[PDB]
Ligand SMILES: *[C@@H]1O[C@H](CO)[C@@H](O[C@@H]2O[C@H](CO)[C@@H](O[C@@H]3O[C@H](CO[C@H]4O[C@H](CO)[C@@H](O)[C@H](O[C@H]5O[C@H](CO)[C@@H](O)[C@H](O)[C@@H]5O)[C@@H]4O)[C@@H](O)[C@H](O[C@H]4O[C@H](CO)[C@@H](O)[C@H](O)[C@@H]4O[C@H]4O[C@H](CO)[C@@H](O)[C@H](O)[C@@H]4O)[C@@H]3O)[C@H](O)[C@H]2NC(C)=O)[C@H](O)[C@H]1NC(C)=O
Ligand SMILES: *[C@@H]1O[C@H](CO)[C@@H](O[C@@H]2O[C@H](CO)[C@@H](O[C@@H]3O[C@H](CO)[C@@H](O)[C@H](O[C@H]4O[C@H](CO)[C@@H](O)[C@H](O)[C@@H]4O[C@H]4O[C@H](CO)[C@@H](O)[C@H](O)[C@@H]4O)[C@@H]3O)[C@H](O)[C@H]2NC(C)=O)[C@H](O)[C@H]1NC(C)=O
Ligand SMILES: *[C@@H]1O[C@H](CO)[C@@H](O[C@@H]2O[C@H](CO)[C@@H](O)[C@H](O)[C@H]2NC(C)=O)[C@H](O)[C@H]1NC(C)=O
Ligand SMILES: *[C@@H]1O[C@H](CO)[C@@H](O[C@@H]2O[C@H](CO)[C@@H](O)[C@H](O)[C@H]2NC(C)=O)[C@H](O)[C@H]1NC(C)=O
Ligand SMILES: *[C@@H]1O[C@H](CO)[C@@H](O)[C@H](O)[C@H]1NC(C)=O
Ligand SMILES: *[C@@H]1O[C@H](CO)[C@@H](O)[C@H](O)[C@H]1NC(C)=O
Ligand SMILES: *[C@@H]1O[C@H](CO)[C@@H](O)[C@H](O)[C@H]1NC(C)=O
């Protein structure tokens with residue numbers, strides 16, 4: 001929009017936003033005791049939140065309403081109503097806050113691992129706690145004028161194509177179960193429960209819907225025209241948004257840049273009204289924000305509206321309330337003149353925003369969250385949940401016993417482009433951290449003598465650094481190589497063009513494997529890279545996926561490597577062979593194989609051979625898993641369901657297994673539980689799909705713990721060609737983990753039961 005020369009938004013991965021959209025405002029609170037609003041109902045803390053917002057909006061001029069439909073809302077100075085910023089980031093810690101540059105207070109916020117790594121922990125309680133800490137820190141900043149009260153998080157699109165520049169931001173490739181679980185825990189942590197009266201921070205689940213590429217084949221996200229079947233929309237592209245609106249009761253949602261089936265998401269009433277509000281029960285006074293600036297893109301480049309004013313009117317009437325951008329505040333005035341919008345329509349959207357702000361305590365100085373301050377940031381940071389999340393999520397992919405490092409390992413050759421990682425560890429959407437502990441610093445802190453060499457860049461073809469790296473390996477007891485990908489490889493606005501290791505890293509690794517020393521390789525980054533040559537090289541003793549491990553990443557990594565902590569992470573995406581992305585267009589949105597070039601996408605449908613499967617992870621001990629059936633689903637749905645708000649949450653039954661530590665090392669345990677059928681519902685039948693996961697506390701040698709994974713009705717439903725969610729009679733089989741240590745067949749009997757009627761059109 002703010003391009004100085006010709007810009008082709010069909011190709012260009014980044015928008016040209018106005019400085020107004022991008023501005024860092026100084027925030028404050030209305031003075032409800034003494035300011036111009038003191039006798040208006042909005043300042044009456046005993047009045048209802050809607051009535052309060054309505055009384056406030058009645059005081060605005062039309063121009064003031066229109067100007068306050070943008071993310072950088074100017075407020076209304078004459079009313080003592082401050083500017084308020086809707087655009088705040090919280091993906092894995094606060095970002096876009098007005099951070100102080102000196103003086104101690106507000107110089108930083110906790111930098112958690114990227115969500116891709118946190119999710120690998122398979123710990124729901126962990127995700128909820130991170131979100132609770134993020135929202136506490138958000139409130140502390142808000143109370144000093146340095147951050148807003150709603151956040152553009154979580155990013156929950158499925159990580160479908162493995163080259164997506166932003167898959168690092170997500171809970172992985174399993175949109176239905178794993179992503180939806182993250183969605184619920186995160187949103188309830190941000191908001192302070194399930195739609196509490198006193199909202200803590202408003203979540204903004206994103207990006208709705210069909211967005212999962214930046215610019216593959218030079219087709220920018222900004223003008224991307226996704227073609228998606230109703231079945232896939234229901235089954236893969238939206239179930240996490242159902243979970244956000246229905247279960248978590250997200251107060252906000254962000255519509256995506258792309259069109260789906262010809263209609264830009266922010267101008268898509270089928271999405272924003274029919275699905276979101278009518279089908280999934282998104283709060284009546286919840287509000288939708290556009291992406292920055294998806295409303296502009298309705299016009300340029302989608303050409304769904306012929307100008308900015310018509311783009312603004314179309315979006316507003318479709319159900320987009322707030323524009324992250326300048327299209328609303330600078331062109332809805334023309335819409336009103338042209339008769340395309342009413343003042344009622346504009347008032348509804350601003351009232352929606354302000355109704356949330358009332359719920360958030362924006363007008364109530366005695367609100368329970370208005371007293372959190374800098375010491376709350378300091379205290380919650382000191383809990384070290386960022387460290388805990390990385391330690392829990394790190395994934396052991398290959399091991400022969402080299403890990404954990406024996407006490408006979410005194411010196412290490414620490415080599416590679418991640419070896420001294422600081423800012424690399426933070427991924428993207430990060431603010432300043434209290435500290436950044438590199439693997440190098442942590443290795444020295446752990447007692448090892450460290451021979452450190454860069455070896456090679458992430459993406460070089462210079463071999464300049466190889467000789468010193470090999471020399472160091474020769475001098476040391478063990479070799480720890482840290483490399484892989486980072487945000488120079490995968491980022492917003494620019495997808496990867498391949499899913500191989502970048503540069504000449506694999507060459508250096510191969511040469512290190514020929515020195516005759518123990519070799520541990522750490523593959524870092526959010527997307528996966530093809531480690532087939534490492535899997536197959538006997539001289540690569542260990543392989544760890546370490547993601548983006550946050551502020552304490554170095555210590556998390558080395559605590560695992562030294563065995564101070566024992567790993568239990570499992571992969572949350574498939575590690576595909578490199579050729580996969582060349583086999584078929586990555587913007588084919590169809591999940592299922594098509595008997596042509598599309599081999600099936602994600603672990604659910606892929607017909608090829610992953611290098612490492614979704615769900616892969618090893619332990620420092622061995623576990624002996626043992627089991628500890630006909631179900632009529634119409635009957636199961638006939639019973640009361642105390643403890644469950646929605647009937648589709650009721651367990652059909654609970655899978656129970658005994659998990660015995662049959663090895664010598666105390667270790668936590670993780671499990672993914674998958675189900676298969678070859679006769680229930682429509683063909684083709686998937687490989688399998690995830691229906692449950694859990695993580696169990698440390699199990700000592702010789703000890704056992706019960707794994708209990710309920711199998712909810714919703715998890716057994718399949719999706720028909722119309723998008724309806726139906727539980728079908730037939731034969732099913734559960735399998736515990738990628739190693740399928742336990743299997744359990746069961747039958748569903750009786751009639752088909754409808755769980756969701758997918759609305760037409
Ligand atoms: C799935 O994820 C969840 C959620 O993240 C994991 O559970 C978390 O586990 C972490 C790490 O073990 C716990 O962190 C520790 O929390 C301490 C504070 O908790 C206590 O107070 C709070 C606030 O009132 C209570 O809520 C807690 O009670 C609840 O939780 C406990 C379990 O923790 C249950 O038993 C209860 O029933 C409650 O449900 C507790 O009472 C916090 O002090 C501690 O931080 C110190 O320790 C770490 C590591 O040692 C240091 O890095 C850090 O700097 C702190 O050290 C300071 O203090 C020590 C004093 O001991 C000094 O020696 C130091 O010098 C320094 O000053 C740590 O953050 C977390 O509480 C817990 N969360 C929840 C919600 O339960 C699960 O384990 C995980 N599950 C699996 C299977 O993996
Ligand atoms: C559990 O929580 C506690 C409480 O927060 C954590 O304890 C804090 O740990 C941090 C990090 O170790 C520590 O911060 C250091 O304080 C030192 C002394 O004041 C500083 O010298 C040091 O600064 C260096 O590191 C920064 C990056 O982190 C750099 O930006 C800075 O420029 C300094 O870097 C120099 O040194 C490094 C390595 O020595 C070198 O690579 C550079 O070249 C450069 O020369 C840190 O700020 C806090 O003091 C701790 N706070 C308290 C109260 O103890 C603890 O880490 C958590 N535990 C886990 C496992 O996460
Ligand atoms: C609709 O509103 C926009 C924004 O207020 C108006 O654009 C401004 O016009 C004023 C007065 O001519 C200029 O001085 C400003 O520079 C413009 N601001 C921006 C950001 O462009 C626009 O004139 C209004 N359109 C109509 C038809 O009323
Ligand atoms: C590892 O990385 C850190 C952070 O990039 C480097 O620390 C910097 O070191 C120089 C002096 O050598 C200081 O002037 C900077 O202020 C440091 N930056 C920070 C953020 O602390 C460090 O030099 C690197 N170490 C190696 C061996 O490459
Ligand atoms: C910005 O790009 C658009 C095409 O997307 C073009 O029509 C417009 O003139 C450009 N603006 C400037 C100042 O070059
Ligand atoms: C703009 O980008 C699209 C997508 O890459 C491309 O097909 C088209 O040819 C480009 N148009 C111009 C005028 O360069
Ligand atoms: C996309 O465009 C870029 C920049 O012009 C170019 O370097 C690249 O070759 C193009 N990619 C494809 C697949 O056409």
Ligand SMILES: *[C@@H]1O[C@H](CO)[C@@H](O)[C@H](O)[C@H]1NC(C)=O
Pocket residue numbers: 632633634635638749750751
């Ligand atoms: C399943 O349950 C329903 C309602 O409880 C019952 O009417 C029906 O006969 C049952 N079907 C079978 C096959 O048991």
Ligand SMILES: [Zn+2]
Pocket residue numbers: 033034
């Ligand atoms: Zn007074």
Ligand SMILES: [Zn+2]
Pocket residue numbers: 031033034035
């Ligand atoms: Zn006052």
Ligand SMILES: [Zn+2]
Pocket residue numbers: 128132188189192193
């Ligand atoms: Zn909670």
Ligand SMILES: [Zn+2]
Pocket residue numbers: 273274
């Ligand atoms: Zn409708």
Ligand SMILES: [Zn+2]
Pocket residue numbers: 223224225259301302303
């Ligand atoms: Zn389009």
Ligand SMILES: [Zn+2]
Pocket residue numbers: 225262302
């Ligand atoms: Zn089009």
Ligand SMILES: [Zn+2]
Pocket residue numbers: 308309330331334
């Ligand atoms: Zn205009």
Ligand SMILES: [Zn+2]
Pocket residue numbers: 089095096429430431
């Ligand atoms: Zn940022």
Ligand SMILES: [Zn+2]
Pocket residue numbers: 666698
């Ligand atoms: Zn123990």
Ligand SMILES: [Zn+2]
Pocket residue numbers: 700703
């Ligand atoms: Zn015991």
